[PDB]
Symmetry: C2
Subunit: 300 residues, 2 copies
């Protein structure tokens, strides 16, 4: 009904390379003359259990990193480690380097992931950073190093790089500076993610998208306050709604003629009574990976 | 849980242009020196009610078609009409023309749509041609001319071009030769699409993807025949399952150890009893826009 839309992947496709060290092959990000990759490419399957990356990196040479961009084989002329991201300096400046920034997103924000395997793009899809800093995406073997990004009018804002898949099936990664999102570490260990919650401001924006597209059955004639909505939202493991969230939902409220607190009263009834066998925008569940900015970008 | 994945849009991004004739602006496909666009760009809002395209095209000149590719303004040196697609011949060969084919897909098959507005790519998403030859996608004003495609190892198989949005909210289009999918015509009229049905072979492939990812609760210990499954599927408006569909599901059956007719018995119980408040791959509804080839491409 209202489809998840990913950013055009053209600017990022010309930056994906294949990085191999021993038996381990993953993906890398080829900005001007720097190939960014997860630092655990230097780790054997045994080393991942308790790696000492500083001692492991010293054991490594430039010739131990085989980098390939399509067919062109790139020659590493240096390697340095930012916190958990390896930086392999190459002889060749990427002639397809776009205008880019390195940003660290907040929990609840969305981004597009260019899933690639052994350096070649396979697909693109829209993600959302869960409140517990995990990603429910599709990452196979060979998927490590694939990056998440947003695009602002000519600029690619790189926001995420996939690093590990937790034993619970969820995925964890870092920003392009090597800092992990959440309490996770690049070590093959039992790591517990926090209690995940539903992004409340995203559900409200998705409900506004339903009203814009003619799906209006869930609108009611009860109202609520921000205080009393939250005490209901906390019971259903929904994130607390702030006045900042009410402010970001402003443009959608003016377009539909439905106050933000009026839509929250609609959401409160949906949480307490369910859907009663009906659907919203073709969905039987409440969707929470559409930010308010994602909705206004599609429903302009 | 198991995400819809769209093809990388890089090869198609370098072919999208903006075509304007009067007040009407839509998107065009710039292959070597040919800009493909819906022929109703020559129609005013009044002309769309009952257009005579042959008489309307004669009234038009080369200088009435303003084509823009980013900033470069392309000079039309000729216009010809394939059945419902306008072909504007330009002075400049597109230097970003990829290897491409023109294909006409079957109902139930999937493809990626590069949604663009006034010639500039805005997003990409995965579609499926409904059995009634409609598309439930996201097409705004300025969305006309955006193309659907698949990629086979270096080749872009263009399969669809958006033309109209029916009064019922669903979308209709043509192949790249100008032949409409379904009984629809490029005229602003009341047009009824057929009774839509669920793509049964796609639901079965999606159930195999659930088994591959550990979601196994729906597997049961009843069996069925292809004849007796269909007589249940016809009641729930599901497409009839053929032996060809059973053959395409072969690779997924061997990987999971579940016979195709065994999975159909699982689907029969889901149709008759429902989900009973549970989910499959994070979904409360049965998903039918994953072809068997889409599943094996993600679950390799």
């Amino acid at each position: 009904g209202f489809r998840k839309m990913a950013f055009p992947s053209g600017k990022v496709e010309g930056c994906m390379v294949q990085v191999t060290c021993g038996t381990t092959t993953l993906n890398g990000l080829w900005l001007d003359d720097v190939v960014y990759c997860p630092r655990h490419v230097i780790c054997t399957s045994e080393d991942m259990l308790n790696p000492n990356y500083e001692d492991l990196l010293i054991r490594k040479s430039n010739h131990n990193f085989l980098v390939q961009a399509g067919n062109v084989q790139l020659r590493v002329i240096g390697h340095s480690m930012q916190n958990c991201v390896l930086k392999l300096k190459v002889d060749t400046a990427n002639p397809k380097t776009p205008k880019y920034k390195f940003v660290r997103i907040q929990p609840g924000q969305t981004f597009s992931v260019l899933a690639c395997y052994n350096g070649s793009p396979s697909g693109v899809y829209q993600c959302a950073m869960r409140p517990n800093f995990t990603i429910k995406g599709s990452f196979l073997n060979g998927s490590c190093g694939s990056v998440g990004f947003n695009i602002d009018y000519d600029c690619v804002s790189f926001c995420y790089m996939h690093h590990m898949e937790l034993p619970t099936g969820v995925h964890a990664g870092t920003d392009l500076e090597g800092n992990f999102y959440g309490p996770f570490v690049d070590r093959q260990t039992a790591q517990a993610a926090g209690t995940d919650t539903t992004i409340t401001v995203n559900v409200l924006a998705w409900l506004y998208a339903a009203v814009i597209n003619g799906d209006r059955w869930f609108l009611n004639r009860f109202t609520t306050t921000l205080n009393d909505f939250n005490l209901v939202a906390m019971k259903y493991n929904y994130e607390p709604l702030t006045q900042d969230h009410v402010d970001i939902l402003g443009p959608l409220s003016a377009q539909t003629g439905i106050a933000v607190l009026d839509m929250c009263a609609s959401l409160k009834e949906l949480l307490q009574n369910g859907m009663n066998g009906r659907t919203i925008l073709g969905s039987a569940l409440l969707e929470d990976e559409f930010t308010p900015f994602d909705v206004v970008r599609q429903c302009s």
